[PDB]
Amino acid sequence: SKLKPFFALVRRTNPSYGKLAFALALSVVTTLVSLLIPLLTKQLVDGFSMSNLSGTQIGLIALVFFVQAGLSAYATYALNYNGQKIISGLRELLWKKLIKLPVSYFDTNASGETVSRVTNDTMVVKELITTHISGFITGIISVIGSLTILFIMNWKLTLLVLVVVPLAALILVPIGRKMFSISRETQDETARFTGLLNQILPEIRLVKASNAEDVEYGRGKMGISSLFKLGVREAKVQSLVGPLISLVLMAALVAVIGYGGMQVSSGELTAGALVAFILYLFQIIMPMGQITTFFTQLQKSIGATERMIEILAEEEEDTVTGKQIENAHLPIQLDRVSFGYKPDQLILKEVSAVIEAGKVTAIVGPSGGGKTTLFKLLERFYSPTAGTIRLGDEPVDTYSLESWREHIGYVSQESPLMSGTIRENICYGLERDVTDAEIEKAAEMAYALNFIKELPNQFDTEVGERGIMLSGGQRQRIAIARALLRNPSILMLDAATSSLDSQSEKSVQQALEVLMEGRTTIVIAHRLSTVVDADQLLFVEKGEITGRGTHHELMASHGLYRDFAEQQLKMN
Amino acid sequence: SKLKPFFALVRRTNPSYGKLAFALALSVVTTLVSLLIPLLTKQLVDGFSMSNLSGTQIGLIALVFFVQAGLSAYATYALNYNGQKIISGLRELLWKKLIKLPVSYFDTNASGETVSRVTNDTMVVKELITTHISGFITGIISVIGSLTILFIMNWKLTLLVLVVVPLAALILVPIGRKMFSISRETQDETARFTGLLNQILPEIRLVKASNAEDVEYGRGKMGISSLFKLGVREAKVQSLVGPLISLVLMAALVAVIGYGGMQVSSGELTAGALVAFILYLFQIIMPMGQITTFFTQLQKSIGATERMIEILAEEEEDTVTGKQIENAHLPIQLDRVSFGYKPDQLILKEVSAVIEAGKVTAIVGPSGGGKTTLFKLLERFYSPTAGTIRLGDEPVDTYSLESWREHIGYVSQESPLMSGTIRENICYGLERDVTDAEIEKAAEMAYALNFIKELPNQFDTEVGERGIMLSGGQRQRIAIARALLRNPSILMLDAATSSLDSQSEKSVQQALEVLMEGRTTIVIAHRLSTVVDADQLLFVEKGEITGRGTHHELMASHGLYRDFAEQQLKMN
Ligand SMILES: CCNc1cc2oc3c/c(=[NH+]\CC)c(C)cc-3c(-c3ccccc3C(=O)OCC)c2cc1C
Ligand SMILES: CCNc1cc2oc3c/c(=[NH+]\CC)c(C)cc-3c(-c3ccccc3C(=O)OCC)c2cc1C
């Protein structure tokens, strides 16, 4: 069950799989030749001892084996590179699916966290696929072969005591656990004392007023004395362990080395044998813990793998957006409409409205954000849970999500910017038309970007790594230029009367209206200052609509009932 | 030399000198004995080796020296215990004066920092005194003696190559540095890629509106391909270093072991000499990093010492207060009051006020540099600098703060239940009389204390762990009970009345005012339903009282500009 989804998504980066069949095999010989490296080492060492100034043939074969082992270690670069290619392909597919995935996923699952999950969970899978698989294979092969060559290397002479040495060292483990437990006790008491002081200290005011200094100091003294009387036991245990570990670690070593010297070395063990023995020890003890590291990394990477496959299993926007082409220029009306994050838990309910072409329209409702979902519905972002959008025969579903979107267009208010790419930032949402110079006509039709025409002279200047350093007016001018360059004129603007103290807004108001005059557009606002200009208003409630009429009757009934009271709170 | 300032606070508690001398003498004994241990190990090993029936005397001497070394390592407990004692003394003195410090220390130096210093700067001094001093001494002694006995035990032959091997590690080290640098490059590129696409993604709204996600995928592709093309260089350089470092290590080990083999095979170096050699090798290689850790920990801890000695300065607050006793039931005046943290940094300008002996008095005005600081200045938390508090011939400025606080009571809006049982919470300010079963006798009339006065346990209630077992609004009743038990005289209450909706405030106010029927009180009462019972008011304009008079006509005169509308707004 573990490896099935893992391979199911790894196979997506298919074409390099055969390469693995090389590298893994190139790994295996790397291990197997490794298994024989100490042996030749022996044949080299005793080669000097038995035959001083040894012959050329054994030297040549030793050299060719060494270069073979080194070149195989280099060829492990092939494994690492294949892993890197797999990771890059996986992450590229992940990014593609994430970008073209429904925005519906984003607002509910902490996109500022999935952003880091991509990189972290890809790095863990990288670590699984690059060195941990080879690590486990080489570890099992190394331990088995090393133990076998050890058996061959002595008639059950020093391996038995060698293996018994950890059996004797088992005595060390309970004392280490006792150390860990009492150290945790010290940490807990330190935390308790720190918490006691942190709690009792800001009350210095009260305790001083009460003139109860002595009781305060007594509580502190009790705490500190408790800490001291626990640290004393810490010291006792440490003093007892010190010799009890150092002596055993020295005794095991002296026992093994003395038994090797006196007995075995007298009759059987050559120096070239002992060097290969040490090499085998250093080659067996080193990779052994790597199997446990492999197991835990494999578990974690399997979890990351489930996360990734969950991410990829969510694609729907592609076939949805590739639909009938349109030409827009039709008034927009909503019949009974409902919406919610869940099919039966609804944020919007039983709402309907009408918006004639050319007439500017605005939306006002509760400050909690109820109007937001309706706005997103008007610009056809979330598919309506229930209801229909009035058009000619209401075909709103069959239209492409690029086409209708690009004819209707979009602009925003609440500080979207990009850093040091001003002209390309203008060209950001453009259809593929480079428009090298003619965009100047847009730059002058902005009616406010003219004031900032010095920046087009630099044409690229950077204001900050995150872009926000350019003031809100600059971004508003850039946005209105974008809107001009997108379509002749169709617009919706967000959060018009929710910030900027109405001042800079008005400074760019002069820029926008004279360009959007006599054109269908929708505006989101919380205050009446700009919406009462010439605009048809829609009064919204908690997931409900009641306001109908253009300005005056809607005011005199609902504003007199609701909107006047709330807008009087925003006078200051 | 900084050691004299360090010992100046170290010697502030001084029972440790004799135990220090004993412990360090035992420590140097441990060092010398451990230095001579490997010779005894050699003698024991050789006696087991050269003779099959090693005499009981040699083994007995080995055992007795082993027991001596173990017992001396045990005696290092004396050093550790002495260190714990000196730490406890240091921390106890630090607390004893810290709790005595003026409030002006705490309102400027924060609460959490101080306690963090108390724990961490003490722990580092413990690490300095307990282990690291002995560590450095034993390290230098061990390295010198081990090198000497390496010179003498074996000829220069083995030692020269043994030391040249680290000189051969000059081949290893720069490539490790190259690894570290390129790995840091990989980390930086990962951070850059994460930051770029983290900036990109939340604009999903705008880009999907612009349906230009193709450019987005292009940017993602460029970034991801850059990361891949740097990771490939990472992998290449890693695969180059691997075999090189492995080969150098194998060569060093094979060279040293082979040379030893010819030595044994040829003659000076005996097996016991070899085990002594190995033991010395480990014994010298352990503390070489320990001395560096000593140096860095000492460098860190000197700053701790400076912080500690900085703490041990300002004991004046509760030392200057042992002056004079008084009855203190007289009306009070304030003259020429213009105060602040520093003469340059003024928080108040020249003001004067009068408060009577039997009626209610409150202070009202803006928060910023207003009511609050004058309230603290009246409660003697901040010492007088240029103004006078008149209780006669300015006697309060010369009277004891103990007496003044004995004749005063303090209750607060925050009302935090201090740690401990409700018994000590109620009798906190009056430890001088035990009041076993008469604490409650004067608390019944409290119209809101009765809500908890039926408590069956009636004493077992405590803070728990954060003070939530009884409500903060209930802690108001506990505090008023404390006040009625303690103070038969003048009282102050702190209350940001434009907070907590005041719904329960009257529910407790109805009690506190009634039980203070004839006691002078000063309160923060800027809200409407609290100035009503305030009688005389003190109106702050900006760090200044611009009017002194009775409740109603005073707000009538002061609301000609601001008070009326502001207070009608506050009640919302
Ligand atoms: C037998 C060969 N193996 C060892 C021999 C050792 O001898 C040591 C002698 C010393 N001089 C005598 C005072 C001191 C100061 C520390 C020693 C340490 C040591 C150093 C730092 C931290 C812990 C220890 C440690 O584990 O020591 C055990 C008490 C040590 C460690 C090992 C592995
Ligand atoms: C083919 C299986 N995979 C490996 C096999 C390895 O074999 C090694 C043998 C050695 N001697 C025998 C001649 C030495 C000295 C280092 C070795 C390293 C090694 C090299 C540099 C840094 C750390 C290590 C390392 O693994 O040490 C971890 C403690 C090593 C590393 C890997 C991945």
mmCIF file of N, CA, C and O in Angstrom, chain B residues 174-217:
data_model
loop_
_atom_site.group_PDB
_atom_site.id
_atom_site.type_symbol
_atom_site.label_atom_id
_atom_site.label_comp_id
_atom_site.label_asym_id
_atom_site.label_seq_id
_atom_site.Cartn_x
_atom_site.Cartn_y
_atom_site.Cartn_z
ATOM 1 N N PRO B 174 39.959 22.052 2.656
ATOM 2 C CA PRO B 174 39.429 23.071 1.732
ATOM 3 C C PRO B 174 38.270 22.562 0.902
ATOM 4 O O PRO B 174 37.362 23.328 0.556
ATOM 5 N N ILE B 175 38.278 21.272 0.568
ATOM 6 C CA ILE B 175 37.176 20.713 -0.197
ATOM 7 C C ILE B 175 35.911 20.676 0.647
ATOM 8 O O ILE B 175 34.805 20.890 0.133
ATOM 9 N N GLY B 176 36.042 20.418 1.948
ATOM 10 C CA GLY B 176 34.894 20.543 2.829
ATOM 11 C C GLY B 176 34.353 21.959 2.870
ATOM 12 O O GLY B 176 33.137 22.173 2.892
ATOM 13 N N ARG B 177 35.249 22.950 2.874
ATOM 14 C CA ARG B 177 34.788 24.336 2.815
ATOM 15 C C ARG B 177 34.064 24.626 1.504
ATOM 16 O O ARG B 177 33.061 25.350 1.487
ATOM 17 N N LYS B 178 34.569 24.083 0.395
ATOM 18 C CA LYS B 178 33.901 24.251 -0.893
ATOM 19 C C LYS B 178 32.506 23.634 -0.863
ATOM 20 O O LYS B 178 31.540 24.218 -1.374
ATOM 21 N N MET B 179 32.393 22.442 -0.273
ATOM 22 C CA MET B 179 31.090 21.830 -0.038
ATOM 23 C C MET B 179 30.165 22.763 0.725
ATOM 24 O O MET B 179 29.007 22.956 0.340
ATOM 25 N N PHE B 180 30.657 23.343 1.819
ATOM 26 C CA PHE B 180 29.799 24.206 2.622
ATOM 27 C C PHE B 180 29.338 25.416 1.820
ATOM 28 O O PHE B 180 28.160 25.792 1.869
ATOM 29 N N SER B 181 30.249 26.025 1.060
ATOM 30 C CA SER B 181 29.897 27.213 0.288
ATOM 31 C C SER B 181 28.847 26.895 -0.770
ATOM 32 O O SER B 181 27.856 27.620 -0.920
ATOM 33 N N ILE B 182 29.044 25.807 -1.517
ATOM 34 C CA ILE B 182 28.088 25.506 -2.578
ATOM 35 C C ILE B 182 26.755 25.040 -1.999
ATOM 36 O O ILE B 182 25.693 25.305 -2.580
ATOM 37 N N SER B 183 26.770 24.365 -0.847
ATOM 38 C CA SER B 183 25.512 24.019 -0.195
ATOM 39 C C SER B 183 24.765 25.270 0.245
ATOM 40 O O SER B 183 23.535 25.343 0.135
ATOM 41 N N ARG B 184 25.495 26.270 0.747
ATOM 42 C CA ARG B 184 24.862 27.542 1.078
ATOM 43 C C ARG B 184 24.283 28.197 -0.169
ATOM 44 O O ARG B 184 23.213 28.815 -0.116
ATOM 45 N N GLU B 185 24.977 28.072 -1.301
ATOM 46 C CA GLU B 185 24.430 28.582 -2.555
ATOM 47 C C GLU B 185 23.111 27.900 -2.897
ATOM 48 O O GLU B 185 22.151 28.558 -3.320
ATOM 49 N N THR B 186 23.048 26.579 -2.723
ATOM 50 C CA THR B 186 21.800 25.861 -2.970
ATOM 51 C C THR B 186 20.694 26.351 -2.049
ATOM 52 O O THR B 186 19.552 26.546 -2.483
ATOM 53 N N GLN B 187 21.011 26.538 -0.768
ATOM 54 C CA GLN B 187 20.004 27.019 0.173
ATOM 55 C C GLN B 187 19.501 28.400 -0.226
ATOM 56 O O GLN B 187 18.297 28.676 -0.161
ATOM 57 N N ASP B 188 20.411 29.279 -0.646
ATOM 58 C CA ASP B 188 20.011 30.619 -1.054
ATOM 59 C C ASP B 188 19.122 30.580 -2.289
ATOM 60 O O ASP B 188 18.140 31.323 -2.377
ATOM 61 N N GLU B 189 19.453 29.727 -3.260
ATOM 62 C CA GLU B 189 18.599 29.619 -4.438
ATOM 63 C C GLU B 189 17.228 29.066 -4.078
ATOM 64 O O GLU B 189 16.212 29.514 -4.622
ATOM 65 N N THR B 190 17.176 28.091 -3.171
ATOM 66 C CA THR B 190 15.886 27.580 -2.722
ATOM 67 C C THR B 190 15.065 28.681 -2.069
ATOM 68 O O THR B 190 13.864 28.817 -2.336
ATOM 69 N N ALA B 191 15.704 29.490 -1.223
ATOM 70 C CA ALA B 191 15.000 30.597 -0.587
ATOM 71 C C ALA B 191 14.505 31.598 -1.621
ATOM 72 O O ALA B 191 13.382 32.101 -1.520
ATOM 73 N N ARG B 192 15.331 31.897 -2.624
ATOM 74 C CA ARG B 192 14.934 32.847 -3.657
ATOM 75 C C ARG B 192 13.732 32.338 -4.436
ATOM 76 O O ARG B 192 12.793 33.089 -4.713
ATOM 77 N N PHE B 193 13.760 31.063 -4.814
ATOM 78 C CA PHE B 193 12.666 30.477 -5.581
ATOM 79 C C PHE B 193 11.380 30.473 -4.764
ATOM 80 O O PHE B 193 10.305 30.856 -5.256
ATOM 81 N N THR B 194 11.486 30.083 -3.490
ATOM 82 C CA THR B 194 10.327 30.100 -2.607
ATOM 83 C C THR B 194 9.763 31.503 -2.476
ATOM 84 O O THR B 194 8.550 31.704 -2.568
ATOM 85 N N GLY B 195 10.634 32.494 -2.273
ATOM 86 C CA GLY B 195 10.168 33.862 -2.126
ATOM 87 C C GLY B 195 9.531 34.406 -3.390
ATOM 88 O O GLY B 195 8.492 35.068 -3.336
ATOM 89 N N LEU B 196 10.139 34.126 -4.543
ATOM 90 C CA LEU B 196 9.578 34.591 -5.804
ATOM 91 C C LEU B 196 8.172 34.056 -5.997
ATOM 92 O O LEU B 196 7.227 34.821 -6.221
ATOM 93 N N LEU B 197 8.005 32.738 -5.895
ATOM 94 C CA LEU B 197 6.679 32.218 -6.197
ATOM 95 C C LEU B 197 5.706 32.486 -5.052
ATOM 96 O O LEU B 197 4.495 32.566 -5.282
ATOM 97 N N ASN B 198 6.203 32.678 -3.827
ATOM 98 C CA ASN B 198 5.331 33.111 -2.741
ATOM 99 C C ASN B 198 4.791 34.509 -3.000
ATOM 100 O O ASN B 198 3.636 34.806 -2.682
ATOM 101 N N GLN B 199 5.620 35.388 -3.561
ATOM 102 C CA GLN B 199 5.126 36.694 -3.980
ATOM 103 C C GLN B 199 4.141 36.555 -5.132
ATOM 104 O O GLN B 199 3.140 37.277 -5.198
ATOM 105 N N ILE B 200 4.415 35.630 -6.048
ATOM 106 C CA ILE B 200 3.586 35.479 -7.241
ATOM 107 C C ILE B 200 2.179 35.022 -6.877
ATOM 108 O O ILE B 200 1.182 35.588 -7.337
ATOM 109 N N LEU B 201 2.081 33.989 -6.045
ATOM 110 C CA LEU B 201 0.857 33.192 -5.985
ATOM 111 C C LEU B 201 -0.377 33.960 -5.519
ATOM 112 O O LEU B 201 -1.429 33.829 -6.167
ATOM 113 N N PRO B 202 -0.346 34.741 -4.433
ATOM 114 C CA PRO B 202 -1.593 35.374 -3.970
ATOM 115 C C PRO B 202 -2.234 36.293 -4.991
ATOM 116 O O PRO B 202 -3.434 36.571 -4.888
ATOM 117 N N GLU B 203 -1.483 36.760 -5.985
ATOM 118 C CA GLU B 203 -2.062 37.506 -7.094
ATOM 119 C C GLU B 203 -2.808 36.626 -8.084
ATOM 120 O O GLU B 203 -3.143 37.090 -9.186
ATOM 121 N N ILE B 204 -3.037 35.365 -7.720
ATOM 122 C CA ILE B 204 -3.810 34.439 -8.531
ATOM 123 C C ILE B 204 -5.102 35.093 -8.985
ATOM 124 O O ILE B 204 -5.537 34.892 -10.121
ATOM 125 N N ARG B 205 -5.706 35.901 -8.113
ATOM 126 C CA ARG B 205 -6.894 36.656 -8.485
ATOM 127 C C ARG B 205 -6.643 37.466 -9.749
ATOM 128 O O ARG B 205 -7.328 37.294 -10.766
ATOM 129 N N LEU B 206 -5.631 38.329 -9.702
ATOM 130 C CA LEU B 206 -5.359 39.214 -10.826
ATOM 131 C C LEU B 206 -4.983 38.429 -12.071
ATOM 132 O O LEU B 206 -5.467 38.720 -13.171
ATOM 133 N N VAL B 207 -4.124 37.422 -11.922
ATOM 134 C CA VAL B 207 -3.619 36.740 -13.110
ATOM 135 C C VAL B 207 -4.726 35.924 -13.765
ATOM 136 O O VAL B 207 -4.846 35.885 -14.995
ATOM 137 N N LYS B 208 -5.568 35.276 -12.957
ATOM 138 C CA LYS B 208 -6.696 34.545 -13.512
ATOM 139 C C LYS B 208 -7.697 35.489 -14.148
ATOM 140 O O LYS B 208 -8.340 35.133 -15.140
ATOM 141 N N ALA B 209 -7.845 36.694 -13.597
ATOM 142 C CA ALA B 209 -8.653 37.701 -14.272
ATOM 143 C C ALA B 209 -8.055 38.052 -15.625
ATOM 144 O O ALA B 209 -8.781 38.281 -16.597
ATOM 145 N N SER B 210 -6.728 38.089 -15.704
ATOM 146 C CA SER B 210 -6.043 38.416 -16.945
ATOM 147 C C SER B 210 -5.854 37.215 -17.859
ATOM 148 O O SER B 210 -5.338 37.388 -18.965
ATOM 149 N N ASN B 211 -6.225 36.015 -17.405
ATOM 150 C CA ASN B 211 -6.116 34.757 -18.144
ATOM 151 C C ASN B 211 -4.773 34.591 -18.846
ATOM 152 O O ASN B 211 -4.675 33.898 -19.864
ATOM 153 N N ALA B 212 -3.724 35.190 -18.286
ATOM 154 C CA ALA B 212 -2.380 35.123 -18.844
ATOM 155 C C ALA B 212 -1.477 34.177 -18.061
ATOM 156 O O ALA B 212 -0.286 34.455 -17.887
ATOM 157 N N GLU B 213 -2.022 33.054 -17.588
ATOM 158 C CA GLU B 213 -1.242 32.151 -16.750
ATOM 159 C C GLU B 213 -0.106 31.497 -17.522
ATOM 160 O O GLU B 213 0.774 30.878 -16.916
ATOM 161 N N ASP B 214 -0.113 31.598 -18.852
ATOM 162 C CA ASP B 214 0.985 31.038 -19.631
ATOM 163 C C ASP B 214 2.302 31.718 -19.285
ATOM 164 O O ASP B 214 3.328 31.051 -19.101
ATOM 165 N N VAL B 215 2.287 33.045 -19.167
ATOM 166 C CA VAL B 215 3.488 33.759 -18.746
ATOM 167 C C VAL B 215 3.872 33.343 -17.335
ATOM 168 O O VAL B 215 5.058 33.279 -16.986
ATOM 169 N N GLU B 216 2.875 33.060 -16.500
ATOM 170 C CA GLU B 216 3.163 32.631 -15.139
ATOM 171 C C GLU B 216 3.895 31.298 -15.134
ATOM 172 O O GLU B 216 4.892 31.124 -14.419
ATOM 173 N N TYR B 217 3.414 30.350 -15.933
ATOM 174 C CA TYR B 217 4.096 29.071 -16.060
ATOM 175 C C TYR B 217 5.484 29.251 -16.647
ATOM 176 O O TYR B 217 6.411 28.521 -16.292
#
